[PDB]
Amino acid sequence: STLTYPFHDWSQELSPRYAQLRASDAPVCPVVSEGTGDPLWLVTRYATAVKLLEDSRFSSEAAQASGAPRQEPVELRAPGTRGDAIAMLREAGLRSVLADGLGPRAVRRHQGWINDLAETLMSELASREGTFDLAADFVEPLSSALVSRTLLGELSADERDLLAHCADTGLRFCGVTHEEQVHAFTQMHEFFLEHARRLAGTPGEHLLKLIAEAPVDQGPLSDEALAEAGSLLVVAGFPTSSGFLCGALLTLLRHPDAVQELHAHPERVPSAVEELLRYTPLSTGSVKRMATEDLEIDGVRIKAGEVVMVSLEAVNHDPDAFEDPDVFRPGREGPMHFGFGRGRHFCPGNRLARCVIEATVRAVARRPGLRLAVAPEEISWHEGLFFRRPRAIPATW
Numbered sequence: 001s002t003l004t005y006p007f008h009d010w011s012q013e014l015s016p017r018y019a020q021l022r023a024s025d026a027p028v029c030p031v032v033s034e035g036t037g038d039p040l041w042l043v044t045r046y047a048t049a050v051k052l053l054e055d056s057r058f059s060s061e062a063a064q065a066s067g068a069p070r071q072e073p074v075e076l077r078a079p080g081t082r083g084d085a086i087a088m089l090r091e092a093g094l095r096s097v098l099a100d101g102l103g104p105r106a107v108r109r110h111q112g113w114i115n116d117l118a119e120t121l122m123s124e125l126a127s128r129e130g131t132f133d134l135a136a137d138f139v140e141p142l143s144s145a146l147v148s149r150t151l152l153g154e155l156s157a158d159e160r161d162l163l164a165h166c167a168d169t170g171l172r173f174c175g176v177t178h179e180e181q182v183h184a185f186t187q188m189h190e191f192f193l194e195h196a197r198r199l200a201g202t203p204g205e206h207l208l209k210l211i212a213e214a215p216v217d218q219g220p221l222s223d224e225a226l227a228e229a230g231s232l233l234v235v236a237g238f239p240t241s242s243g244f245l246c247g248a249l250l251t252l253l254r255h256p257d258a259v260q261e262l263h264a265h266p267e268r269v270p271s272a273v274e275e276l277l278r279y280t281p282l283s284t285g286s287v288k289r290m291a292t293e294d295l296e297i298d299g300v301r302i303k304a305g306e307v308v309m310v311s312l313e314a315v316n317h318d319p320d321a322f323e324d325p326d327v328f329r330p331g332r333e334g335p336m337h338f339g340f341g342r343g344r345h346f347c348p349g350n351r352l353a354r355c356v357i358e359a360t361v362r363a364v365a366r367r368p369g370l371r372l373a374v375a376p377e378e379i380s381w382h383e384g385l386f387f388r389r390p391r392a393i394p395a396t397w
């Protein structure tokens with residue numbers, strides 16, 4: 001194939017290429033990685049994505065082994081490490097602890113201060129005269145608090161900035177040198193080699209503490225393994241939450257009549273949270289799986305070792321699954337969205353994510369009149385990030 005991937009759609013306007021692919025006859029389409037030249041397959045239709053992501057012979061772990069074709073310009077790991085940290089934790093027998101640190105018990109522990117913080121932040125903005133920046137003044141402190149209090153432990157401001165910077169530098173398709181990307185993973189790993197044990201020991205019930213204290217049959221977790229967990233929690237939790245919350249705010253500010261309904265009918269907020277997860281695009285790339293044997297999906301042969309990608313954004317905008325997919329329609333009763341993926345790799349951060357998204361939507365819904373202070377086309381976007389994010393969101397009442 002000569003069609004290079006990704007499609008350079010760094011703003012909320014999805015590349016028209018996704019619709020062209022969806023409308024093609026084949027359910028799986030060949031592309032080539034811009035960053036590596038590797039051949040890849042790409043799925044954009046909901047019905048095919050379901051079959052792929054629910055078939056465990058298309059392996060997520062195997063899409064990382066050395067030699068695997070990939071979309072990313074560099075491997076998403078510090079050199080010399082395993083980089084399969086979620087598998088390593090599950091292998092060590094910690095699914096129990098992961099459920100306790102990320103599941104409904106964690107939401108019950110944290111939802112109180114998350115909603116308090118969202119309201120405090122929004123209230124401070126409501127008290128200002130003039131304009132403010134919802135990215136710097138709302139999303140950054142809320143997402144930083146989520147990561148510190150629920151995942152990593154008490155971070156200094158400088159530590160928070162280092163991790164934010166490593167995530168933004170390493171999780172990119174372009175904009176920096178390959179060497180700079182690899183070094184961002186190395187810097188993050190070296191940080192947690194030195195400090196993860198200390199962070200696991202700070203006050204709170206954050207996940208890194210729960211992992212460090214848990215019983216493991218093969219003897220407690222080592223320094224390298226705790227450091228691998230740290231890097232995982234940054235890459236999985238920080239740029240996703242910050243990018244999504246920024247994008248969701250832009251969606252809410254562009255749909256005032258939706259917000260006025262939520263203001264009038266607070267019980268409708270959960271439905272709007274689910275529609276944001278469908279409608280708001282986050283990743284500029286795709287989830288990936290490697291065929292572990294010769295496989296055939298909807299009639300296309302995939303050879304052992306080939307990698308198949310699913311664009312969650314394309315699937316969430318598939319008109320065969322959603323009527324009027326490019327309309328923001330809370331309470332549309334269609335199928336489940338793909339914002340958190342599908343099947344056995346469904347985002348385990350989904351409970352905490354929904355908590356922070358719900359808190360954000362309610363903070364907005366309680367205060368009608370919030371609007372962009374510039375036109376949407378004047379919003380400036382970070383170009384090349386895996387997780388789309390605006391540079392600023394100028395806003396006002």
Ligand code: HEM
Nearest residue numbers: 086236237240241244287288339340341345347348349353
């Ligand atoms: C902020 C909004 C978030 C969104 C939209 C999001 C989205 C996703 C998606 C789509 C996947 C599936 C990847 C795949 O199929 O290969 C995923 C996986 C994952 N997410 Fe999230 N995520 C978010 C936040 C978080 C948070 C806060 C955490 C941790 C606290 C987290 C931890 C993980 C982990 C560990 C995985 C890998 C699971 C596996 O491969 O089995 N995510 N996330």
Ligand SMILES: [Br-]
Nearest residue numbers: 011012013376
């Ligand atoms: Br846009």
Ligand SMILES: [Br-]
Nearest residue numbers: 322323333334
């Ligand atoms: Br629908």
Ligand SMILES: [Cl-]
Nearest residue numbers: 095098099348
């Ligand atoms: Cl899990």
Ligand SMILES: [Cl-]
Nearest residue numbers: 098099102348
């Ligand atoms: Cl879990």
Ligand SMILES: [Cl-]
Nearest residue numbers: 104105106108
């Ligand atoms: Cl509970």
Ligand SMILES: [Cl-]
Nearest residue numbers: 123124126127
């Ligand atoms: Cl007030």
Ligand code: NA
Nearest residue numbers: 176177178179
């Ligand atoms: Na380079």
